[PDB]
Design a protein around this ligand. Structure first.
Ligand SMILES: O=C(O)[C@H](Cc1c[nH+]c[nH]1)[NH+]1CCCC1
Length: 322
């Protein structure tokens, strides 16, 4: 029910000023861009939830199938009594892990780490009900800034799933992994999900689905800006574009102006122009090679002790330690 400990390191005024900075810089750049963190307002989070069920979007259910068939092994390997989730704690995946920990009579604690306090409270209620006696310590924070705020209590399995790590470009990605590694004690383990290089047709379709749901998700970032900063983006005037970048081996999401657009962002006293056909970068989703996952982990000071992958080789999960 209501039993909970919650620490909150996020302030609304801080979030608001960050959006102002990001939007000003991103829209005044010669190559325009917007950071994908701003996708996830209430509407956008709901749209992403739907993306996880699209037939083209294999990542979620591929990862889920790996956990479904190997959760006992994962939990045995970790030997952890505390599950730290860098993410919501809402999904079936969380419960696969928690169930496996309970089955092994190891489970003592759940530490959800997410940017939305409301979601954390909901997760706390649900998990508290399903696993009576469990200690729940929630942390409201940004996983690029507040990893140091995660409690060091217990033997901890830190999980970072869904190929979230792929939404970070190499430099911030390496900084994140190194920082996370520095918070791990002997006994702690990292469970990392990484989407893998594969047929490029399948990759693009996964980010450009027939139903146009991803397109709606992408364009919604314009609605966020419109609402929060009093802008006048015409969402209809922008086309969703998903590209495979073979040099960097990553999917890229873009918004392309159908015709010349003049956008006023009132809250920034800012005007910007899009030429007909001008494209704005809104997200990258890096795809990994198995051998390189080992290397990126090692660079962060982490040793990969276990590697699970589906039989098609579509997706990978790593267990790593200090
Ligand atoms: O890169 C991805 O696959 C998605 C974001 C996304 C999904 N469809 C379009 N973008 N990430 C969101 C957090 C986990 C992965």
């Amino acid at each position: 029910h209501m039993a909970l400990s919650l620490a909150n390191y996020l302030a609304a005024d801080s979030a608001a000023e960050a959006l102002r900075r990001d939007v000003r810089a991103g829209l005044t750049a010669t190559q325009k861009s917007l950071p994908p963190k701003w996708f996830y307002d209430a509407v956008g989070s709901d749209l992403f939830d739907q993306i996880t069920r699209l037939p083209e979007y294999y990542p979620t259910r591929t990862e889920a199938q790996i956990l479904r068939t190997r959760s006992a092994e994962i939990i045995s390997a970790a030997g952890a009594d505390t599950l730290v989730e860098l993410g919501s704690g809402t999904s079936e995946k969380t419960r696969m892990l928690l169930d496996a920990m309970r089955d092994a009579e190891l489970l003592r604690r759940f530490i959800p780490f997410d940017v939305d306090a409301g979601v954390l409270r909901s997760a706390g209620a649900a998990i508290g009900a399903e696993y009576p006696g469990i200690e729940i310590d929630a942390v409201c924070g940004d996983f690029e800034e507040h990893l140091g705020k995660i409690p060091h209590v217990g033997r901890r399995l830190v999980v970072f799933l869904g190929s979230t790590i792929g939404n970070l470009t190499p430099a911030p990605r390496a900084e994140f992994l190194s920082t996370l590694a520095d918070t791990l004690q002997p006994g702690d383990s990292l469970l990392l999900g990484t989407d893998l290089v594969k047929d490029t047709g399948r990759l693009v379709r996964a980010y450009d689905d027939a139903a146009g749901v991803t397109a709606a998700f992408n364009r919604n970032v314009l609605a966020v800006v419109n609402r929060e900063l009093s802008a006048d983006f015409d969402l209809d005037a922008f086309e969703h574009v998903a590209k495979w970048n073979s040099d960097e081996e990553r999917i890229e999401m873009w918004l392309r102006a159908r015709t010349a657009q003049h956008v006023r962002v009132a809250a920034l006293d800012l005007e910007v122009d899009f030429a007909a056909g001008e494209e704005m970068l809104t997200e990258v989703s890096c795809k990994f090679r198995p051998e390189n996952v080992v290397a990126e982990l090692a660079e962060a000071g982490l040793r990969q002790t276990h590697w699970w992958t589906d039989p098609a080789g579509d997706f990978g999960l790593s267990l790593a330690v200090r």
